[PDB]
Write an enzyme that holds these catalytic residues in place. Structure first.
Site, PDB file in Angstrom:
ATOM      1  N   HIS A  53      62.642   0.748-102.557  1.00 42.45           N
ATOM      2  CA  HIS A  53      61.093  -1.134-102.618  1.00 42.45           C
ATOM      3  C   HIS A  53      60.773  -0.791-100.962  1.00 42.45           C
ATOM      4  CE1 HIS A  53      65.197  -1.516-104.564  1.00 42.45           C
ATOM      5  NE2 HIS A  53      64.807  -2.309-105.676  1.00 42.45           N
ATOM      6  N   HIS A 100      62.110  -2.356 -91.478  1.00 41.46           N
ATOM      7  CA  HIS A 100      60.930  -1.946 -92.310  1.00 41.46           C
ATOM      8  C   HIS A 100      60.066  -3.168 -92.839  1.00 41.46           C
ATOM      9  CE1 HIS A 100      63.974  -5.594 -93.808  1.00 41.46           C
ATOM     10  NE2 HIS A 100      63.128  -5.653 -94.671  1.00 41.46           N
ATOM     11  N   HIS A 132      56.722  -4.869 -95.133  1.00 36.63           N
ATOM     12  CA  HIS A 132      56.441  -5.330 -96.849  1.00 36.63           C
ATOM     13  C   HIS A 132      55.239  -5.449 -96.696  1.00 36.63           C
ATOM     14  CE1 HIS A 132      60.526  -6.893 -97.738  1.00 36.63           C
ATOM     15  NE2 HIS A 132      61.033  -7.126 -96.177  1.00 36.63           N
ATOM     16  N   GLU A 153      54.682 -11.464 -95.892  1.00 35.89           N
ATOM     17  CA  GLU A 153      56.570 -12.420 -96.236  1.00 35.89           C
ATOM     18  C   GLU A 153      55.953 -14.028 -95.864  1.00 35.89           C
ATOM     19  OE1 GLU A 153      60.070 -10.096 -96.824  1.00 35.89           O
ATOM     20  OE2 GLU A 153      59.379  -9.844 -98.951  1.00 35.89           O
ATOM     21  N   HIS A 203      60.035  -6.384 -89.953  1.00 38.34           N
ATOM     22  CA  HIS A 203      60.874  -6.841 -90.154  1.00 38.34           C
ATOM     23  C   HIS A 203      62.550  -6.081 -89.388  1.00 38.34           C
ATOM     24  CE1 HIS A 203      60.617  -9.519 -93.874  1.00 38.34           C
ATOM     25  NE2 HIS A 203      60.090  -9.762 -93.066  1.00 38.34           N
ATOM     26  N   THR A 254      65.012 -11.913 -97.743  1.00 40.67           N
ATOM     27  CA  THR A 254      63.942 -12.070 -98.112  1.00 40.67           C
ATOM     28  C   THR A 254      63.785 -10.918 -99.507  1.00 40.67           C
ATOM     29  OG1 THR A 254      62.167 -10.089 -97.103  1.00 40.67           O
ATOM     30  CG2 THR A 254      62.423 -12.630 -96.992  1.00 40.67           C
TER      31      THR A 254
END
EC number: 4.2.1.1
Length: 257
Positions: free
Chosen positions: A61, A91, A93, A103, A116, A195
């Site tokens: 992911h 991590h 996004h 996000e 995050h 999330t």
């Protein structure tokens, strides 16, 4: 299983995780005009001097930078929080292009990426117990914009070639997450969720106002990662962000005027 595509992406998650349509989902759009300054909020205390990173993981992911959370070594306190929250992982996004990737959004603006830093409330003893509680987690969210390189990120970028595909990990010791923070700790805060599945409604979100800068070359290295496993058809790890969810019955509070 869940992912970010057309057939398994965010709009599908509710079928396996019905809380996806819950009352306190994340991320959200931060409307800066309606977030109210709350003079009762404290400065955030970020104490990462003794943080002990151990490993970086491609989980299919994103990639996770994992920490030893077996003692109070890297803790978040203060701000909107009661008690002490221990760092377990960070991590990101990110997008396929610099115009998307975050996000949370700020007045509908999407950043190129979002970091995050995930911490669990020590009063619940472990992470898996914490995520079952409404105040179980505190996630520090930090926006990334593309401009100057972030020198404290380069060690992460360096290692990504070694974890290209899902299921690959590498030793990642002695990495200092302080090098990922912006200058100011001014923030917005609200109650929300993880999330990614299982989307549990256990997070106090603390979203910093000030983005960090990373270079185009740094982000481009994130976009060379793969969502697939070794030897499978290549599908670039990009656009691994959940869009903004309905605010519902929530207030976003600002630490700053």
């Amino acid at each position: 299983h869940w992912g970010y595509g057309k057939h398994n992406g965010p709009e599908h998650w509710h079928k396996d995780f019905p809380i996806a349509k819950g009352e306190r989902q994340s991320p959200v759009d931060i409307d800066t005009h309606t977030a109210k300054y709350d003079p009762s909020l404290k400065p955030l205390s970020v104490s990462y001097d003794q943080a002990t990173s151990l490993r970086i993981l491609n989980n299919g992911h994103a990639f996770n930078v994992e920490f030893d959370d077996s003692q109070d070594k890297a803790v978040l306190k203060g701000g909107p929080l009661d008690g002490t929250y221990r760092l377990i992982q960070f991590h990101f996004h990110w997008g396929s292009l610099d115009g998307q990737g975050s996000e949370h959004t700020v007045d509908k603006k999407k950043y190129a990426a979002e970091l995050h830093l995930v911490h669990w409330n020590t009063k619940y003893g472990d992470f898996g117990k914490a995520v079952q509680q409404p105040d179980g987690l505190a996630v520090l969210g930090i926006f990334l914009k593309v401009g100057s390189a972030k020198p404290g990120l380069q060690k992460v970028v360096d290692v990504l070639d070694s974890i290209k595909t899902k299921g690959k990990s590498a030793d990642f010791t002695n990495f200092d997450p302080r090098g990922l923070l912006p200058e100011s700790l001014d923030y917005w805060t609200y109650p929300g969720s993880l999330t990614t599945p299982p989307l549990l409604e256990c997070v106090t979100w603390i979203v910093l106002k000030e983005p960090i800068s990373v270079s185009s070359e740094q982000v481009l290295k994130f976009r060379k990662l793969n969502f697939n496993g070794e030897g499978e058809p290549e599908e670039l790890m990009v656009d691994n962000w959940r869009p903004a969810q309905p605010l519902k019955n929530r207030q976003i509070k600002a630490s700053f005027k």
